[PDB]
């Protein structure tokens, strides 16, 4: 079997991708954020604290025949970004595309943190991560392509972000047609339960690659690219005007600037995000200064991938024995 379904930015500024998901029967349709940086199928819902509820999709599982209480199950998340939810569980049918998974664990939100109360957009999340982080107690849960593997006819997801447009997420299939060249595969650490991988090295627009091992995980979840201070200095360098302000956070330019390119190395191939990928508008509206997509890793712990870097490439998170990454240009 096989899965496909559209994913679109929530905003101007690509901030996030929600791509549509039905659960329970009747079908209850629900944009949610496919993220492979977490592993928690969670949804706002008819128990979520109506504070907390501002514009956002509920699922209510009393109106579903097939949703049954999984009894004693409780959940509760912690993202990087400071943000959170928790609630209880439910098991009940999950379809993407057209491809279904009956008993699939939906993670109902009794309290959700405010950045998800004022993302009006956002209805939950269905975590594509490892399964080993999955914050079900006392009874760990799968993923949703965890439950599919074995139905599709290729064990694998693929992910084609657009830049300010909307875009794919395939399921048990490769689109030949959506890409140019070739995927280079790569070795995944499944240690952190993350899409975790080493990227060869970079370049800063037109400059010299320079050969570097930079670990970090494949995110779908994280809007921005973190990478090592060193990279990161290296890139805002080459924009005049551009500087770290404590005040805002991270790495300002002027917004009049044209930003350079950046590339990523993929064993000995190439990824090329272009420079437009790497601005993020106005810090506060009106302001002449604009915030950037590359932004040092050095608080976190980790270097993320994200949409900034993903969206440049057409992404195989290949579930096979040895999981292991796919990346080719688009
Ligand atoms: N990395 C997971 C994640 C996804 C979305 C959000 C937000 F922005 F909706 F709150 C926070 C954290």
Not at 24 to 37: E, K, M, R, S, V
Not at 143 to 164: Q, R
Not at 197 to 213: M, P
Request: glycine share 12%; charged share 10%.
């Amino acid at each position: 079997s096989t899965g496909s379904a559209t994913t679109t930015p929530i905003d101007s500024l690509d901030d996030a991708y929600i791509t549509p998901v039905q659960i329970g029967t009747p079908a209850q349709t629900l944009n949610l954020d496919f993220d492979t940086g977490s592993s928690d199928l969670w949804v706002f819902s008819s128990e979520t604290t109506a504070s907390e509820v501002d514009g956002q999709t509920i699922y209510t599982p009393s109106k579903s025949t097939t949703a049954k209480l999984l009894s004693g199950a409780t959940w509760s998340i912690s993202y990087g970004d400071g943000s959170s939810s928790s609630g209880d569980v439910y098991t009940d049918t999950v379809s993407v595309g057209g491809l279904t998974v009956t008993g699939q664990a939906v993670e109902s939100a009794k309290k959700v943190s405010s950045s998800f109360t004022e993302d009006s957009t956002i209805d939950g999340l269905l975590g594509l991560a490892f399964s080993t982080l999955n914050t079900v107690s006392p009874t760990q849960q799968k993923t949703f392509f965890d439950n599919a593997k074995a139905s599709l006819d290729s064990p694998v997801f693929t992910a084609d972000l657009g830049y300010h447009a909307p875009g794919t997420y395939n399921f048990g299939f490769i689109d030949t047609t959506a890409y140019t060249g070739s995927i280079t595969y790569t070795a995944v650490s499944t240690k952190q339960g993350f899409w975790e991988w080493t990227s060869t090295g970079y370049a800063v627009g037109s400059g010299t690659f320079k050969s570097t091992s930079i670990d970090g995980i494949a995110d779908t979840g994280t809007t921005l690219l973190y990478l090592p201070a060193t990279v990161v200095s290296a890139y805002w360098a080459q924009v005049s005007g551009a500087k770290s302000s404590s005040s805002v956070g991270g790495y300002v330019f002027p917004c009049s600037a044209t930003l350079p390119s950046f590339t990523f190395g993929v064993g000995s191939a190439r990824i090329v995000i272009p420079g437009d990928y790497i601005d993020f508008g106005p810090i506060s509206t009106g302001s002449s200064s604009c915030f950037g997509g590359i932004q040092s890793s050095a608080g976190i712990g980790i270097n993320i991938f994200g949409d900034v870097a993903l969206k440049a490439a057409f992404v195989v998170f290949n579930g096979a024995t040895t999981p292991t990454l796919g990346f080719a240009s688009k």
